[PDB]
């Protein structure tokens, strides 16, 4: 039960998703965030 934001084309950083990218929801943990 996990979510991979890499297959959608977005990326998962370690800090809150930067405004330079869009929010694809959440990443593996709350400490990381997906971006696109």
From Swiss-Prot:
GO terms for cellular component: extracellular exosome; extracellular region; extracellular space; Golgi lumen; membrane; microvesicle; sperm midpiece. Its main location: secreted. One of its GO terms (molecular function) is identical protein binding. One of its GO terms (biological process) is defense response to bacterium. It is found in: Secreted; Membrane. Keywords: Antibiotic, Antimicrobial, Defensin, Disulfide bond, Membrane, Secreted, Signal. Disulfide bonds join 5-34, 12-27, 17-35. Blood plasma. Sperm. Highly expressed in the lower head and midpiece of sperm. Significantly reduced levels found in the sperms of asthenozoospermia and leukocytospermia patients (at protein level). The keyword Metal-binding does not apply. Has bactericidal activity. May act as a ligand for C-C chemokine receptor CCR6. Positively regulates the sperm motility and bactericidal activity in a CCR6-dependent manner. Binds to CCR6 and triggers Ca2+ mobilization in the sperm which is important for its motility. This is Beta-defensin 1. It comes from Homo sapiens. The lineage of its organism: Eukaryota, Metazoa, Chordata, Craniata, Vertebrata. The chain holds residues 33 to 68 of 68 of the full protein.
């Amino acid at each position: 039960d996990h979510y991979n934001c890499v297959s959608s084309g977005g990326q998962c950083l370690y800090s809150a998703c930067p405004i330079f990218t869009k929010i694809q929801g959440t990443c593996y943990r709350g400490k990381a965030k997906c971006c696109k």
